[PDB]
Design a protein around this ligand. Structure first.
Ligand SMILES: Nc1ncnc2c1ncn2[C@@H]1O[C@H](CSCC[C@H](N)C(=O)O)[C@@H](O)[C@H]1O
Length: 243
């Protein structure tokens, strides 16, 4: 889809290796039923999660459709981690292997724009589960985005980043079909800007439960935070787990 062509060169500046990353690694590790049964990440990106997670669970298999994102992770793998890169599309990727933990996080599933494509990805993810394995999906929570828009099709916001002179401006657009378009502009301390855009589908725990039931899975308790906080409509992300 070109998300890596939009972001791969600066993705780690947008979503850096900070405490939010550490919280996700800790939560996924706690949610792993059995590291000896293996781990696969759908949408591995630059390895922001897979690299540190592999330091606890061992080798992680990481699937991504973007050559640019995989190339960025390969650079990082020369220094850290134990990850097998797999170039593949999570709507189509099929294997004879099965895994104790299958995870798809940081709104990867919302980059699939139609219910049909999301349903297909959940079917493929379910087929990768070992018996007793767990599927973990994390994506952006929908109600807070609608609240942010407050009845307007377009809205703009700016998030200052820790380093002086840095931050990200987002131009947000709501579109028909529960679509959410963003253009993000990173402002760097050296005075340069980087622009990238993405189109996502606003997705809910209700919808993911239906995808998972169609794939033969049953839901576990929905979460608003990796620490086990139950789902609410205010948190920026949510986590759904299936067995
Ligand atoms: N259909 C698809 N199949 C595989 N990867 C896909 C995909 N659609 C989007 N992606 C990938 O999903 C990733 C979303 S960004 C999240 C990256 C990583 N999981 C992290 O948490 O940091 C990108 O790397 C993008 O290339």
């Amino acid at each position: 889809i070109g998300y890596g062509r939009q972001f791969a060169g600066w993705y780690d500046r947008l979503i850096p290796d900070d405490e939010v990353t550490a919280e996700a690694v800790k939560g996924l590790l706690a949610l792993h039923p059995a590291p000896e049964a293996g781990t696969i990440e759908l949408g591995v990106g630059t390895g922001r999660i897979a690299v540190p997670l592999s330091e606890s669970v061992g080798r992680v298999t990481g699937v991504d459709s973007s050559p640019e994102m995989l190339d960025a992770m390969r650079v990082k793998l020369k220094e850290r981690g134990d990850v097998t890169p797999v170039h593949g599309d999570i709507r189509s990727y099929t294997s004879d292997s099965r895994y104790g933990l299958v995870y798809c996080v940081c709104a990867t599933l919302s980059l699939l724009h139609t219910p049909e494509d999301q349903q297909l990805a959940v079917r493929r993810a379910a087929d990768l589960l070992a018996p007793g394995g767990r599927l973990v999906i994390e994506t952006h929570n929908k109600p807070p985005i609608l609240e942010l828009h407050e009845g307007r099709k377009r809205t703009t916001y700016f998030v200052p980043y820790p380093e002086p002179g840095t931050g990200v401006q987002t131009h947000s657009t709501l579109l028909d079909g529960d679509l959410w378009h963003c253009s993000h502009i990173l402002y760097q301390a050296n005075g340069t800007t980087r622009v990238g855009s993405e189109l996502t589908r606003l997705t809910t725990p209700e919808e993911i439960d239906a995808y998972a039931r169609a794939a033969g899975l049953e839901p576990e308790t929905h979460l608003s935070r990796w620490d086990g906080t139950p789902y609410n409509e205010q948190s920026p992300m949510f986590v759904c787990c299936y067995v």
